[PDB]
A paper describes a structure:
Glycylpeptide N-tetradecanoyltransferase 1, commonly known as N-myristoyltransferases (NMTs, EC 2.3.1.97), are universally conserved eukaryotic enzymes responsible for a major post-translational modification (PTM), myristoylation (MYR). NMTs are thought to transfer a C:14:0 acyl-CoA (MyrCoA) exclusively to the N-terminal glycine (Gly) of specific substrates. These structures reveal snapshots across the entire catalytic mechanism including the reactive intermediate state, thereby providing the high-resolution map of MYR reaction chemistry.
We therefore investigated whether peptides featuring Lys3 could be NMT substrates through either or both Gly and Lys moieties. We next challenged whether blocking the alpha amino group of a Gly-Lys starting peptide with an N-acetylation, by analogy with the crystal structure featuring Cα3 rotation, could render the ε-amino group of Lys3 reactive for MYR. MS analysis of the reaction in the presence of HsNMT1 revealed that Lys-MYR occurred. Finally, determination of the crystal structure of HsNMT1 in complex with an acetyl-Gly-Lys starting peptide clearly showed Lys-ε-MYR. Again, we could capture different steps of the ε-MYR reaction, prior and after nucleophilic attack, in the different monomers of a single crystal. We show that the Nε of Lys3 interacts directly with the C-terminus catalytic base, the Nε of Lys3 occupying the position of wat2 observed in the HsNMT1:MyrCoA:X complex.
Residue numbers in the entry:
A (entry chain D): 2 to 9
B (entry chain A): 105 to 496
The structure:
Amino acid sequence: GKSFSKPR
Amino acid sequence: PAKTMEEASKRSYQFWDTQPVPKLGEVVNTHGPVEPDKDNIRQEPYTLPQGFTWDALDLGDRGVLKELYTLLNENYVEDDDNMFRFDYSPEFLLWALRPPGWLPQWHCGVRVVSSRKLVGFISAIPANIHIYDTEKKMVEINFLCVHKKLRSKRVAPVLIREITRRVHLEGIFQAVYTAGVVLPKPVGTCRYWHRSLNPRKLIEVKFSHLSRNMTMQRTMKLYRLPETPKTAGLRPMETKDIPVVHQLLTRYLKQFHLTPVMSQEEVEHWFYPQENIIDTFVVENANGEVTDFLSFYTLPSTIMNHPTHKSLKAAYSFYNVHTQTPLLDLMSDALVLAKMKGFDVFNALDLMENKTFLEKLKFGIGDGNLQYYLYNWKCPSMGAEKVGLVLQ
Ligand SMILES: CC(C)(COP(=O)(O)OP(=O)(O)OC[C@H]1O[C@@H](n2cnc3c(N)ncnc32)[C@H](O)[C@@H]1OP(=O)(O)O)[C@@H](O)C(=O)NCCC(=O)NCCS
Ligand SMILES: *C(=O)CCCCCCCCCCCCC
């Protein structure tokens, strides 16, 4: 992305 | 930077207020450019702070490509907790940055005059974009990066204005881009979801946590996958599949409101398999006809400051087209294939029809939004399920 996500 | 939209409307945007984008607060009921095309373009590069110079990067030079790899490996996007950082490979960067139509002046680097150290970058690639009822030639902006030591010094606005200028010179006046931050003004807001493939590793590195009421043994059994895919006739895409994959993609995308319009050459570039970069599998049925395909690209991340686990291997859902195989079955085989190829996690956004399978296939919702933006184009926002564009 332009965003490193992780499980909430 | 703001993460929530409500938190962003308390913010003032000293740079974005000067740009032809809608204001965060206004509602858009029109379809068209924010401002007319310019018929004279500034010929001179914008001025950088003293001691820094522009340098267009020849990514065909192995040494220069490696400098960009290192800039991004050390300074590009991190998660919120500063535990993980994208680790785009050199060969992946070539894939992302030299698609058909790529231009050398659009690989826009900034160097320290004395040391020549690469400290900044921004890129454009050309792309034909369908937005509601309009097809426009645009650019896709990506890989905006300022060295950590140069941050908060007004350098990113100069990179943006300079790439804008260099794109204007080529006759293009619209762009599409994505950000994890809220800016004026999202055309669409998507959400990353994650499907564990190696739950143990993910927990040890604190990418994920154990669910409140279940054990590690349970978590491992929960995420176990078959050893091999189930869809009849699934195989890797070959050169002979380029036309039908283009056909399938083009027809499938018509149902969304923000999509690329790819030539057959662009389809070859973006989907033809390259190990450790892009995987595409087609379904060739009992009659020899290709009726579906799945695809995902390879993007590992550095695990920062960890003594044993240094990298996290992630697969990213790309474009998945179904016409005879159920999408749910297609994506289950994607997961199995990613597991087989050694990935630790499988990521996918909630755009296109992905919400129809995310929960059923045991994805967990992420903490990061991916906002989609258009530059110099006014149109109504759309729900995630109407976004049909995936960027690297
Ligand atoms: C993004 C990055 C280039 C910004 O550089 P910076 O030194 O922190 O920001 P600057 O001081 O140069 O100027 C900030 C201006 O550019 C805007 N801006 C910040 N990040 C932006 C981004 N990814 N895209 C577009 N504009 C951005 C800011 O909103 C601000 O404009 P504003 O006054 O209207 O709010 C830098 O932080 C970076 O390299 N981050 C890691 C890679 C990355 O792109 N992360 C962004 C994910 S959303
Ligand atoms: C993430 O790296 C994307 C960063 C987007 C920065 C803003 C770009 C705005 C559009 C500039 C090009 C306009 C060409 C007409």
